[PDB]
mmCIF file of C-alpha atoms in Angstrom:
data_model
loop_
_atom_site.group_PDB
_atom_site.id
_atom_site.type_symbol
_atom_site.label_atom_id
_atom_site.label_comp_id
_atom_site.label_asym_id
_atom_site.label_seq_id
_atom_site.Cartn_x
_atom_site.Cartn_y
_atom_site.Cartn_z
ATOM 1 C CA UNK A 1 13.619 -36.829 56.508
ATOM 2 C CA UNK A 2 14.282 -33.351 56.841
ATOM 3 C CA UNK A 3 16.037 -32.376 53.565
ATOM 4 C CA UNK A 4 13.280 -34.102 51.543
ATOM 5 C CA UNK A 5 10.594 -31.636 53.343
ATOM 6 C CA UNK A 6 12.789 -28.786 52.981
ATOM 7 C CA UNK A 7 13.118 -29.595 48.924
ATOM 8 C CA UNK A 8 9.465 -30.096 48.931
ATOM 9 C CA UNK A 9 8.468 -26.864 50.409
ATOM 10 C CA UNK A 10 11.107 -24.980 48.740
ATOM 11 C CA UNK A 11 9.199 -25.902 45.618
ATOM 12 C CA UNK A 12 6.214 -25.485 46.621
ATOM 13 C CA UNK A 13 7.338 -21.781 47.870
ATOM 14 C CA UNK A 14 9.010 -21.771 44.284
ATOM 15 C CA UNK A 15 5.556 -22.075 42.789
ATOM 16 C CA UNK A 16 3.480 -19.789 44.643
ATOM 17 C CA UNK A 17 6.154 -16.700 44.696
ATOM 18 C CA UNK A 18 5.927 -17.209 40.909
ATOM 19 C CA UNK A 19 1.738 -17.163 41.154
ATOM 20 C CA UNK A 20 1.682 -14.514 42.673
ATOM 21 C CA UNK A 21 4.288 -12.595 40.443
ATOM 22 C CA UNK A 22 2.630 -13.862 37.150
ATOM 23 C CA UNK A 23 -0.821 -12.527 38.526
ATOM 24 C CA UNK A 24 0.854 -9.016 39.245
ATOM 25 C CA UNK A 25 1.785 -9.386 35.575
ATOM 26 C CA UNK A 26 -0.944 -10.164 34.146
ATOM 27 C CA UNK A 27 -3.537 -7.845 36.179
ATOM 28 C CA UNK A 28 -0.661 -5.325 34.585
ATOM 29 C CA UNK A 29 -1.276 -6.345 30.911
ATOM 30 C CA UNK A 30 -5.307 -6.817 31.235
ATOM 31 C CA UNK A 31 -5.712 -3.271 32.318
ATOM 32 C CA UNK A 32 -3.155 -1.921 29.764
ATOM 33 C CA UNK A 33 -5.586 -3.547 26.927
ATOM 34 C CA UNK A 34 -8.868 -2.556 28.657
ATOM 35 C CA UNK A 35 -7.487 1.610 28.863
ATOM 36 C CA UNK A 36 -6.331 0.570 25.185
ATOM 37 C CA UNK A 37 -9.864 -0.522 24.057
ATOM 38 C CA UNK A 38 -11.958 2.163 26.329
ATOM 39 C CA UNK A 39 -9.567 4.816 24.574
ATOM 40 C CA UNK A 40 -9.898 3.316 20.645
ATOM 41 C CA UNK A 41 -13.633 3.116 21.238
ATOM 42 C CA UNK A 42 -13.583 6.898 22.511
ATOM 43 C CA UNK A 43 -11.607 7.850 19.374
ATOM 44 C CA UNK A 44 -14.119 5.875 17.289
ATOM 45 C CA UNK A 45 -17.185 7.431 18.480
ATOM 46 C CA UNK A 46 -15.700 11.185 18.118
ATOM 47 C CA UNK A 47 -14.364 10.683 14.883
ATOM 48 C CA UNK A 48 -17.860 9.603 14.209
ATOM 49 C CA UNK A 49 -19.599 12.665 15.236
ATOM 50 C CA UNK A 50 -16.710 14.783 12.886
ATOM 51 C CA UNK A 51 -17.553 12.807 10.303
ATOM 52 C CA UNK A 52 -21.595 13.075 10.391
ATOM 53 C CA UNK A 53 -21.127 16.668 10.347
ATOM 54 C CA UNK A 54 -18.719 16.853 6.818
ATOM 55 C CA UNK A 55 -21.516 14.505 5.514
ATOM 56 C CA UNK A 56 -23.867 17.289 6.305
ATOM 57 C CA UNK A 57 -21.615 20.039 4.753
ATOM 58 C CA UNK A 58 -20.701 17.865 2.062
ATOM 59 C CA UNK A 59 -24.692 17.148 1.205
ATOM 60 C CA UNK A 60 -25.128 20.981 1.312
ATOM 61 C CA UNK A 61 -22.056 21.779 -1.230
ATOM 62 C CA UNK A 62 -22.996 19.226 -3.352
ATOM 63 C CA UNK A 63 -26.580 20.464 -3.698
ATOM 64 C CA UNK A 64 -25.015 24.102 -4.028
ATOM 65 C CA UNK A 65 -22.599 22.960 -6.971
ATOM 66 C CA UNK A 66 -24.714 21.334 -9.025
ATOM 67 C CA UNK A 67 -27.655 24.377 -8.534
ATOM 68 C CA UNK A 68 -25.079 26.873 -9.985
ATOM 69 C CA UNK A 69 -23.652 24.352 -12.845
ATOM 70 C CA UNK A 70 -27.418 24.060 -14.071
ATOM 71 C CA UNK A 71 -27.537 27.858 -13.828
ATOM 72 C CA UNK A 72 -24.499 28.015 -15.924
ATOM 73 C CA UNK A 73 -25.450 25.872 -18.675
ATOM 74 C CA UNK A 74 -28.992 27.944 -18.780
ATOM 75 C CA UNK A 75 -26.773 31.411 -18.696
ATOM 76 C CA UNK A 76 -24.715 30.172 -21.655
ATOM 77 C CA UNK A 77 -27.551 28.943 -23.070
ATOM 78 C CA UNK A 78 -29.480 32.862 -23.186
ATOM 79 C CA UNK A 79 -25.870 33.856 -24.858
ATOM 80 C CA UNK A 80 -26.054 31.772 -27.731
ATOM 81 C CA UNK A 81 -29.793 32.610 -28.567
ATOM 82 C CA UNK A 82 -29.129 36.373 -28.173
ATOM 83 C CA UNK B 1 7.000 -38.413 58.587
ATOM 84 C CA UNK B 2 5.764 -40.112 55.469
ATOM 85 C CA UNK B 3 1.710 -38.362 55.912
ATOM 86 C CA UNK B 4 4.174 -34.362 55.580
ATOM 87 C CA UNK B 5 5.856 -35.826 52.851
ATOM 88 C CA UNK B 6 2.987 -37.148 50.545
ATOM 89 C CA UNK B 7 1.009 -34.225 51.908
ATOM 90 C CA UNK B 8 3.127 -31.801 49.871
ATOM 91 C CA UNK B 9 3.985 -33.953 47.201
ATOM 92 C CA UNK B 10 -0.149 -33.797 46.610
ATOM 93 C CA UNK B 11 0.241 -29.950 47.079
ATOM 94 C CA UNK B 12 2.967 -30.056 44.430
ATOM 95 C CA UNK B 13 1.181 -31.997 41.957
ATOM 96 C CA UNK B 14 -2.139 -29.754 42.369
ATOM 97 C CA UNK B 15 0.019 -26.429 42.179
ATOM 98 C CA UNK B 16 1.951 -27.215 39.189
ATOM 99 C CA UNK B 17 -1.274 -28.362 37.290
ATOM 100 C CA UNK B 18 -2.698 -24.825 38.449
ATOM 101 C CA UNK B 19 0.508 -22.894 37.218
ATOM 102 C CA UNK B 20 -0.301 -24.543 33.641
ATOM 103 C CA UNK B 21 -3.997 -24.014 33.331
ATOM 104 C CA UNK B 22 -3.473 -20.433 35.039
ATOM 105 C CA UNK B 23 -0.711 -19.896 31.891
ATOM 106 C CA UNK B 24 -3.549 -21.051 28.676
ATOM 107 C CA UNK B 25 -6.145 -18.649 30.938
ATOM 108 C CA UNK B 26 -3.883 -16.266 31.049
ATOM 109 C CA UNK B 27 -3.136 -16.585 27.465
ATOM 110 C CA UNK B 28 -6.569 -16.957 26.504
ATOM 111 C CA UNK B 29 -7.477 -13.599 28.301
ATOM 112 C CA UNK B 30 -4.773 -11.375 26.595
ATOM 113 C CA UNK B 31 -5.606 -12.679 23.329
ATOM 114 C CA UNK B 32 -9.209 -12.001 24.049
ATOM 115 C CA UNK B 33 -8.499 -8.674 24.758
ATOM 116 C CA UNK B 34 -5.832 -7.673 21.889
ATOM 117 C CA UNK B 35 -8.726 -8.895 19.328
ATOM 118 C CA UNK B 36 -10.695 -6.481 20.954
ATOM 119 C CA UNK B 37 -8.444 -3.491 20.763
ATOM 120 C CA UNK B 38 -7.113 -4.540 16.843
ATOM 121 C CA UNK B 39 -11.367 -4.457 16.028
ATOM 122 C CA UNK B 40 -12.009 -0.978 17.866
ATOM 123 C CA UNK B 41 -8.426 0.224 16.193
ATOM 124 C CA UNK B 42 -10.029 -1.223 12.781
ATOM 125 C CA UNK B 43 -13.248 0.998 13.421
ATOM 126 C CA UNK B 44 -11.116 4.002 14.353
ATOM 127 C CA UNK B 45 -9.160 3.574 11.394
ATOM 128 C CA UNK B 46 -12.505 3.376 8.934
ATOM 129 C CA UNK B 47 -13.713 6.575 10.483
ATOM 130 C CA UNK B 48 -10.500 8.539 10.042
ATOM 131 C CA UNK B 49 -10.458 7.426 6.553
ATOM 132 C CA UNK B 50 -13.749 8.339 6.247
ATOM 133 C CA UNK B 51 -13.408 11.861 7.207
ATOM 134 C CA UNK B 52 -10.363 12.152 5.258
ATOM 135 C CA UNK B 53 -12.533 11.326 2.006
ATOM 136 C CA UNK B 54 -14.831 14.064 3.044
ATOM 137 C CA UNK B 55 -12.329 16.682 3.805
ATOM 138 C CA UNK B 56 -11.211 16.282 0.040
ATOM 139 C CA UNK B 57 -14.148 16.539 -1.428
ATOM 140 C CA UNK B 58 -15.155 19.529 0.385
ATOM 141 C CA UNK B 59 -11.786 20.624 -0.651
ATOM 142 C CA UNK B 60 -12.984 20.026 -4.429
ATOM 143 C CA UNK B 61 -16.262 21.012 -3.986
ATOM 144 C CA UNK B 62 -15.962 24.434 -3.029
ATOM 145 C CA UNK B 63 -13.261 25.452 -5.257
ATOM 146 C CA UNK B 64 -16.047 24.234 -7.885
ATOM 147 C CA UNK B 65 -18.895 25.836 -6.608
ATOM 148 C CA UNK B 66 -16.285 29.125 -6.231
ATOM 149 C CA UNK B 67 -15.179 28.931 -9.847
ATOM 150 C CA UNK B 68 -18.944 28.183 -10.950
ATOM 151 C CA UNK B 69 -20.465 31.085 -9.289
ATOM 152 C CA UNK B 70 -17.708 33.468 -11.293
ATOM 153 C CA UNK B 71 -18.667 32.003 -14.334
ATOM 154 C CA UNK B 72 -22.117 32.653 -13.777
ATOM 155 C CA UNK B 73 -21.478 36.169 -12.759
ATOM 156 C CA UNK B 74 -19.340 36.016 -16.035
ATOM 157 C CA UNK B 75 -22.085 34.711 -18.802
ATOM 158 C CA UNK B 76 -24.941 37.351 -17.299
ATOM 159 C CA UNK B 77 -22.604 40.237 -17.767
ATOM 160 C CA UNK B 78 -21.683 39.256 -21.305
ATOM 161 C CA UNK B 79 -25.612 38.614 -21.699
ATOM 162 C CA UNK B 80 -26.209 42.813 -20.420
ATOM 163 C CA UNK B 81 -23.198 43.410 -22.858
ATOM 164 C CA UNK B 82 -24.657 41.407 -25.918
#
């Protein structure tokens, strides 16, 4: 009976050489895509802060524009009535 | 003897019915993860867009507010001149 328990065994070697492998593997990918999501949500979050403060200069400019395009319109205004 | 041989044929049946649920977990875990890096990507993406909008209409903005501000200058000199 000993070739059928060598073929047995030799399987069951098979199997857990490739377990262990596949869980090298995968432990591989897993932490590839956790550094990948760590380092998109870091990305996220500064772009964030860059982008709150262009909304602040962009509130200011706006205000700014539109206070000298009234005092345009009031400037060429004084011309005609002169 | 026959209690080695059905001893790891049992093994064999239990390991190769771990090999496929360990594969769909396995699976299930990297797709898990790839939707969360393809979301945070997607929110990195919005921001960056984002900023890029701003950044233009800064760009705009000021060469308004610049041109403006001449004009200004402009209409209350003609007005000391009228």
């Amino acid at each position: 009976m000993e070739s059928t328990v060598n073929a047995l065994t030799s399987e069951l070697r098979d199997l857990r050489a490739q377990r262990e492998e596949a869980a090298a593997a995968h432990a591989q990918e897993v932490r590839r895509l956790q550094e990948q999501a760590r380092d998109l949500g870091k990305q996220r979050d500064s772009c964030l802060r860059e982008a709150e403060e262009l909304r602040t200069q962009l509130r200011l400019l706006e205000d700014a524009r539109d206070g000298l395009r009234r005092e345009l319109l009031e400037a060429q205004r004084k011309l005609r009535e002169s």
